[PDB]
């Protein structure tokens, strides 16, 4: 669970929450998986490394997506 | 022969398929690029009302690109 983690501070907490809503469970718990290797020890290691990188960066096609968004936003201009 | 329907061409005029599926041969019409001056002049000198055909290869895609499947139910 995210908000219950006292060892994390609030800015990093809400930052991870808003940046990685895809992986968070309905009950509020963040989950992450790894099976790239056969060694589950190494899997746990790279998982904790991923979340540490997430902590650090929180403490710190896209063309097409923004194009179609700008198209939608130039179209949507209408008055009641 | 000539390419078409997911069929590339090598520098030595070798024909190869781009995707996975079924090969087949057909006849279709031929329109060159304006830079192919030879065929351009040919189709100009050609008499009106008549049009030339040529052979073409087509590979029929058997499978689709992929499939949508569940990854996690959360």
């Amino acid at each position: 669970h995210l908000a219950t983690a006292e060892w994390i501070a609030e800015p990093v907490r809400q930052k991870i929450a808003i940046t990685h809503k895809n992986k968070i469970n309905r009950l509020g718990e963040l989950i992450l998986t790894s099976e790239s290797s056969r060694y589950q020890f190494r899997n746990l290691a790279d998982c904790l490394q991923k979340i540490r990188d997430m902590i650090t960066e929180a403490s710190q096609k896209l063309h097409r997506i923004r194009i179609e968004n700008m198209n939608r936003e130039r179209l949507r201009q209408k008055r009641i | 022969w000539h390419p078409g329907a997911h069929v590339g061409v090598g520098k030595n005029k070798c024909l190869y398929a781009l995707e996975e599926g079924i090969v087949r041969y057909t006849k279709e019409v031929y329109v060159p690029h304006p830079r192919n001056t030879e065929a351009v002049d040919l189709i100009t000198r050609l008499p009106k009302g008549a049009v030339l055909y040529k052979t073409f290869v087509h590979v029929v895609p058997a499978k689709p690109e992929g499939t949508f499947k569940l990854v996690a139910m959360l």
């Binding site: 309905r26 | 087949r24 057909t26 087509h58």
Partner: protein, 354 residues
């Protein structure tokens, strides 16, 4: 060996006894014209068309819908002639055209088009996106009656709704405003349906916004049997095309099988088949209006998964088939060392018994 030609071979109409008197293709453009015309034309030999082109039945699509009005073609063409006459008689259009400084009212052009020739292009878009092949299994109709819908965002602005427009779930979270300016002295019916929203089986749809027995253009008075609920386009599912259908209810009908309680957010309740729905309910009425749009996943979709629908959210993904590799052989010849990597499962090392 040789065999006779089955059908009339090309360029047989021409004669070779006279060649110089015949005029030639002066232009690549003219050759292209003739070429693509004959390409659209059929042939007896095997062709690209009868492999990669729609295999629609030869019979015309059945559509017992609104016929066109009886417009006096004579008077219409006369008024058009007068219009073009006064247009050419105008004086500033000469300089405007010859200086390339003119424009046109887009709103007026849009209104006049959707009035006169809109419905045919709307039919076109319908049978392109596949609304009719999926709903009626081939049968079609013409949305003669125009239709405007808007999702009012906040208080000032609004997202329009027309054939082929993006709609965000945050904007579609609430019920939209609708207009179809038809008094008719009779009733109308409207329904918002999602085709590819259902997941358990194909050829199945959901229904989000239903109104029946609408006396006139006013919408609030039209009762609802299926209450409002926004769609739930899941992450990874891609896109969902949702369509507004509108039918011309000649007289009030009953809804027993269709009567639904308070939403209950039940997919088994919302699911049905528009085909038999129309076959049983709509024998009195016929289609009158049509629109649609597309929707995608969003944070509001996530919220309604976790809270509104009262269910866990699904997570789909597009996954490609594995890349083909042939059967190995004990002794490859003239293949680089990554031949083994092309087949090895684990990139990691492994030691047998040590």
């Amino acid at each position: 060996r040789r065999t006779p030609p089955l059908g009339p071979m090309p360029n047989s109409d021409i004669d070779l006894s006279n060649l110089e008197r015949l005029e030639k293709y002066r232009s690549f453009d003219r050759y292209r014209r003739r070429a693509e015309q004959e390409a659209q034309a059929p042939h007896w030999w095997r062709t690209y068309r009868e492999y990669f082109g729609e295999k629609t039945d030869p019979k015309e699509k059945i559509d017992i819908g609104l016929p066109p009005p009886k417009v006096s073609r004579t008077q219409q063409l006369l008024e058009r002639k007068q219009a073009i006459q006064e247009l050419r008689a105008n004086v500033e259009e000469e300089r405007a055209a010859r200086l390339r400084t003119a424009s046109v009212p887009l709103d007026a052009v849009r209104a006049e088009w959707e009035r006169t020739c809109g419905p045919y292009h709307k039919q076109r878009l319908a049978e392109y996106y596949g609304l009719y092949r999926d709903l009626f299994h081939g049968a079609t109709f013409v949305p003669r009656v125009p239709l405007h819908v808007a999702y009012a965002v906040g208080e000032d602005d609004l997202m329009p709704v027309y054939c082929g427009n993006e709609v965000t779930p945050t904007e579609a979270a609430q019920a939209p405003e609708v207009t179809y300016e038809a008094e008719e002295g009779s009733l109308w019916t409207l329904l918002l349906t999602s085709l590819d929203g259902h997941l358990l089986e194909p050829d199945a749809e959901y229904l989000h916004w239903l109104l029946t027995n609408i006396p006139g253009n006013r919408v609030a008075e039209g009762q609802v049997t299926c209450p409002y609920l926004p769609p739930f386009p899941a992450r990874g599912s891609g896109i969902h095309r949702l369509a507004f259908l509108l039918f011309k209810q000649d007289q009030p009908i009953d809804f027993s099988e269709d009567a639904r309680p308070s939403p209950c957010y039940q997919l088994a309740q919302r699911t049905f088949r528009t085909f038999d729905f129309y076959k049983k309910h709509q024998e009195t009425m016929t289609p009158a209006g049509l629109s649609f749009f597309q929707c995608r996943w969003d944070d509001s979709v996530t919220y309604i998964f976790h809270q509104l629908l009262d269910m866990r959210e699904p997570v789909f993904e597009f996954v490609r088939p594995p890349p083909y590799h042939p059967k190995q052989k004990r002794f490859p010849h003239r293949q680089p060392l990554r031949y083994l990597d092309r087949y090895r499962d684990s990139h990691e090392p492994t030691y047998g018994i040590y």
